[PDB]
Design a protein around this ligand. Structure first.
Ligand SMILES: CC(C)CCC[C@@H](C)CCC[C@@H](C)CCC[C@@H](C)CCOC[C@@H](CO[C@@H]1O[C@H](CO)[C@@H](O)[C@H](O)[C@H]1O[C@H]1O[C@H](CO[C@@H]2O[C@H](CO)[C@H](O)[C@H](O)[C@H]2O)[C@@H](O)[C@H](O)[C@@H]1O)OCC[C@H](C)CCC[C@H](C)CCC[C@H](C)CCCC(C)C
Ligand SMILES: CC(C)CCC[C@@H](C)CCC[C@@H](C)CCC[C@@H](C)CCOC[C@@H](CO[C@@H]1O[C@H](CO)[C@@H](O)[C@H](O)[C@H]1O[C@H]1O[C@H](CO[C@@H]2O[C@H](CO)[C@H](O)[C@H](O)[C@H]2O)[C@@H](O)[C@H](O)[C@@H]1O)OCC[C@H](C)CCC[C@H](C)CCC[C@H](C)CCCC(C)C
Ligand SMILES: CC(C)CCC[C@@H](C)CCC[C@@H](C)CCC[C@@H](C)CCOC[C@@H](CO[C@@H]1O[C@H](CO)[C@@H](O)[C@H](O)[C@H]1O[C@H]1O[C@H](CO[C@@H]2O[C@H](CO)[C@H](O)[C@H](O)[C@H]2O)[C@@H](O)[C@H](O)[C@@H]1O)OCC[C@H](C)CCC[C@H](C)CCC[C@H](C)CCCC(C)C
Ligand SMILES: CC(C)CCC[C@@H](C)CCC[C@@H](C)CCC[C@@H](C)CCOC[C@@H](COP(=O)([O-])OC[C@H](O)COP(=O)([O-])O)OCC[C@H](C)CCC[C@H](C)CCC[C@H](C)CCCC(C)C
Ligand SMILES: CC(C)CCC[C@@H](C)CCC[C@@H](C)CCC[C@@H](C)CCOC[C@@H](COP(=O)([O-])OC[C@H](O)COP(=O)([O-])O)OCC[C@H](C)CCC[C@H](C)CCC[C@H](C)CCCC(C)C
Ligand SMILES: CC(C)CCC[C@@H](C)CCC[C@@H](C)CCC[C@@H](C)CCOC[C@@H](COP(=O)([O-])OC[C@H](O)COP(=O)([O-])O)OCC[C@H](C)CCC[C@H](C)CCC[C@H](C)CCCC(C)C
Ligand SMILES: CC(C)CCC[C@@H](C)CCC[C@@H](C)CCC[C@@H](C)CCOC[C@@H](COP(=O)([O-])OC[C@H](O)COP(=O)([O-])O)OCC[C@H](C)CCC[C@H](C)CCC[C@H](C)CCCC(C)C
Ligand SMILES: CC(C)CCC[C@@H](C)CCC[C@@H](C)CCC[C@@H](C)CCOC[C@@H](COP(=O)([O-])OC[C@H](O)COP(=O)([O-])O)OCC[C@H](C)CCC[C@H](C)CCC[C@H](C)CCCC(C)C
Ligand SMILES: *C/C=C(C)/C=C/C=C(C)/C=C/C1=C(C)CCCC1(C)C
Ligand SMILES: *C/C=C(C)/C=C/C=C(C)/C=C/C1=C(C)CCCC1(C)C
Ligand SMILES: *C/C=C(C)/C=C/C=C(C)/C=C/C1=C(C)CCCC1(C)C
Lengths: 227, 227, 227
């Protein structure tokens, strides 16, 4: 049962596309090899979300999972998006703060586990088992946020004020936003359906656009990205 | 309806396998840590194509997608191949020219979008929607080729003549070849069926073998790969 | 027909989880940026296996493939695990020995081919074709082991005794273990069913736990991981 949410899908598609476009049109002249990296990553993010929102607006990113007492529409494309998208975001933060490869690898891996585990949960037929997965995925996330908030902040304090500041903002943004997803999941049509898929998609759209475009804007608009 | 094309699949399998074998038997003695990288990448390419051509010759890489007024055989394995294969190729070019990580990341990402988007298009049931995807994927490609042709060429001009020259050839080859794929797609059984899957596969075989083995030969046969 | 093996799945889940937990609780204080990398990789490994063993214990990682004269339960999750897990393991060995990027790339690629090819074999409907894939995958493996045993050993001889020693042990362990998998596959319910899926899973559990936790223990317990 997925059609009334089309409005947010289409609006999500537009925002992602324009957000991409805008970022593209801004990274052209950039010559700094460091600023360059930030534009690539930050541009790639909305670009991926674009293709996936579009896949949902066209019905491809929509699937049917049997559980509870019916056939439930699971928008799988979200994970296909988040799988490459979340780690890309983390990467931005990693470069910005100049984290160790080991911590970068540890996060990228914790992130893939988080989205991968989330996809399993979203497709699992045993209604009760869907929450075990949600539980594993959320632990994965709290680990990621734990590092971002405590480990990275410490690494940022050693950079110049501009970088420290932009990181702080960015950090606060992603942490507050990333944790909303599990709560949305838990109350949406994929978990304990308290909110209809209609509103679910809306919350996810606002969140997504904020976690990427909004995120990107904040970052790409700082001198923090330069050496 | 996929069986008369078996001949090109089998021939594609043989060429990929021997192409791999030959490359393997050539990288053995190589000690230069730089030449080493080029052999790995360039060897891995046909090796992947091998497994995928074989998957098509055995019926595994073949699927059925409903669209238009019938059930259409979509060789999905092509994308499974191209997904790892195209970026690997790009990587070769990146090392050769010594491109910035940011541009390397930007291309790898543009490439994954291109093949990923292509796979969606190839599996999309709404006949008309298949061209939207083709349209997104082709834009992705033109971006990649734009950088290769203009950005990379500039980066190569700063290398020694041997490297500049080999890049030029390589560049001209991949650009001319990579753009044939969308045209083939557009006229083949996955788009506006003007050419039968039978000939489609043939064009794809010639193209593939050229874009990899041919490509590999040109490169591995130059001193351009050495420091 | 997959239920009597539940016992090994559940025990596999517990061991992977605790193995992860234990490793996590050990990498906390570690400050050395090199030791850090080893903890990330080595911790991520069992963590992945955890999620996949769990997926099998809950029925999600189980699928049905038609071949021979019946419907056969294929535990696909094993490959989803091994796909990220085997290369991670290799990576540990690569860092430990400080191998060239080209050889690291060549192995990672040979490994993905090995698991990818194995997954195809495990899902291939033409009973006879399943062994062609097994044959390709095993060649892939023998290449990996060839390098580990001969190429890496040579690279390790140039490190300090502690590192050389830990590598030797590790090397001997992975080589002896990794080769058991194809033999198990060949005699298990996925190949020439001589052993029942029940015992198959047991052998795979012992193997897995050994190839990761056991492996991890040996490594993380040496000073070899420090600069
Ligand atoms: C280069 C890297 C190193 C990249 C790696 C990429 C790869 C590994 C990503 C995997 C991502 C995962 C997370 C997504 C998988 C989720 C999975 C559960 C969902 C799978 O389904 C979708 C998949 C297959 O589609 C299908 O084709 C099969 C073969 O033909 C069919 O057998 C399936 O049935 C079919 O599924 C579809 O159709 C169903 C329709 O049913 C119909 O419903 C209507 C309703 O009105 C009606 O009832 C009809 O009667 C009924 O028949 C539908 O329900 C299903 O949902 C489905 O549509 O699709 C392939 C997706 C593709 C892989 C997405 C890619 C995403 C983007 C483009 C990625 C960009 C990534 C780059 C790589 C990032 C760069 C980063 C750098 C830093 C490295
Ligand atoms: C290590 C990395 C970091 C690696 C990441 C690897 C991963 C993410 C790659 C994903 C690649 C994507 C792009 C491919 C997905 C395309 C997707 C749409 C197609 C999916 O279908 C194929 C998939 C599943 O097969 C199936 O198993 C299910 C479970 O059992 C079944 O439910 C499905 O139905 C089944 O699909 C098959 O069977 C269908 C049969 O129907 C029958 O048709 C006959 C016709 O005569 C008759 O009518 C019968 O009656 C009828 O029943 C068939 O139609 C379907 O097409 C299908 O065969 O398969 C898994 C593929 C595997 C993942 C391919 C791997 C590719 C190679 C080996 C990769 C090498 C990569 C390394 C990693 C590169 C190294 C690079 C370094 C630089 C990093
Ligand atoms: C970030 C990177 C760069 C990461 C890339 C990740 C990605 C590419 C990995 C792909 C891995 C591949 C190897 C696994 C694919 C194997 C494939 C053949 C199996 C596919 O099936 C599973 C898949 C889809 O599930 C399904 O959803 C569809 C859509 O809704 C349905 O149409 C399918 O039918 C459904 O399949 C399920 O249900 C079947 C049920 O049938 C029922 O059986 C019961 C029996 O009692 C009864 O008869 C019922 O009546 C009947 O209906 C069942 O049989 C099927 O098996 C299946 O359950 O699932 C998605 C899996 C997800 C992708 C796994 C992720 C793994 C973990 C979490 C990865 C952690 C990775 C990080 C990235 C590593 C970090 C490393 C760093 C160094 C980079
Ligand atoms: C799992 C395993 C380790 C547990 C052993 C359970 C044992 C009593 C067996 C009974 O469990 C039987 C199975 C169904 O299988 P069936 O064949 O249909 O019967 O129930 C389904 C199994 C259970 C309901 C699920 C158990 C899940 C674990 C408790 C998961 C841990 C994940 C948390 C998010 C992590 C917290 C970390 C903390 C340390 C900070
Ligand atoms: C039974 C279990 C398998 C189930 C658990 C659920 C699990 C599937 C999801 C969690 C994801 C997890 C597996 C990801 C792997 C992370 C691993 C690679 C990290 C290796 O560690 C690398 C260091 C980098 O060091 P730094 O630069 O000084 O910072 O991590 C950062 C160092 C930090 C400064 C210190 C961090 C300390 C930890 C937060 C505490 C250890 C965790 C606890 C024992 C319990 C788990 C909590 C849960 C929220 C992760
Ligand atoms: C998408 C969105 C941005 C467009 C809003 C469309 C709006 C009028 C809604 C009607 O669109 C309704 C949907 C079907 O959904 P349904 O629920 O079945 O009804 O049609 C299907 C939707 C449309 C037919 C597809 C629109 C696609 C966009 C125009 C795609 C852009 C991709 C190009 C390749 C990029 C060119 C780049 C340039 C800037 C250089
Ligand atoms: C609505 C949209 C979402 C739909 C578009 C379709 C889209 C899905 C497919 C395109 C793929 C694209 C998303 C890939 C992301 C690329 C991005 C990461 C690049 C960031 O940029 C990194 C720099 C590296 O700099 P260098 O070393 O000096 O060279 O790129 C190279 C710098 C170059 C020297 C300058 C390049 C300039 C551009 C070619 C012009 C900008 C593009 C245009 C506004 C329109 C799009 C054209 C289409 C062909 C890409
Ligand atoms: C028809 C074929 C397509 C079918 C074959 C099955 C195939 C699909 C599976 C094999 C996986 C293979 C494709 C993986 C690609 C590897 C490739 C990228 C390697 C490039 O090479 C990089 C170097 C790194 O050099 P170093 O640091 O001095 O060590 O490899 C290491 C250098 C070593 C020191 C020297 C190694 C020599 C080789 C072992 C001998 C060459 C192989 C033989 C001709 C036959 C194949 C044997 C099979 C067991 C691989
Ligand atoms: C652009 C998208 C962003 C920043 C997405 C972030 C997504 C998450 C933090 C998702 C988390 C989830 C859980 C913690 C558990 C349940 C399922 C998920 C995948 C929704
Ligand atoms: C070895 C294989 C090579 C070099 C493959 C290259 C493939 C492409 C450039 C494919 C491009 C496509 C489009 C631009 C749109 C439609 C679908 C594709 C995936 C065929
Ligand atoms: C933690 C898991 C480990 C170390 C797994 C190793 C797995 C292999 C070496 C698997 C090899 C296989 C073949 C060589 C051919 C047949 C199928 C496989 C995938 C089981």
């Amino acid at each position: 049962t997925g059609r009334p949410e089309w409005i947010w899908l289409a609006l999500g598609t537009a925002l992602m596309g324009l957000g991409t476009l805008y970022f593209l049109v801004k990274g052209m002249g950039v010559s700094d090899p460091d600023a360059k990296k930030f534009y690539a990553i930050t541009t790639l993010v909305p670009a991926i979300a674009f293709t996936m929102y579009l896949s949902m607006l066209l019905g491809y990113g929509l699937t049917m999972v049997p559980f509870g007492g019916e056939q439930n529409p699971i928008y799988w494309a979200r994970y296909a998006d988040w799988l490459f998208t979340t780690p890309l975001l983390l990467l931005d933060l990693a470069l910005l703060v100049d984290a160790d490869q080991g911590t970068i690898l540890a996060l990228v891996g914790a992130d893939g586990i988080m989205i991968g585990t989330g996809l399993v949960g979203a497709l699992t037929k045993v209604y009760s088992y869907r929450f075990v997965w949600w539980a594993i995925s959320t632990a994965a996330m709290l680990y990621i946020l734990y590092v971002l908030f405590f480990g990275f902040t410490s690494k940022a304090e050693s950079m110049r004020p501009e970088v420290a500041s932009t990181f702080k903002v960015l950090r606060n943004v992603t942490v507050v936003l990333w944790s909303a997803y599990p709560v949305v999941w838990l109350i949406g049509s994929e978990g304990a359906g308290i909110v209809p898929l209609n509103i679910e998609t809306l919350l996810f759209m606002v969140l997504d656009v904020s976690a990427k475009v909004g995120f990107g804007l904040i970052l790409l608009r700082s001198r923090a990205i330069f050496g």
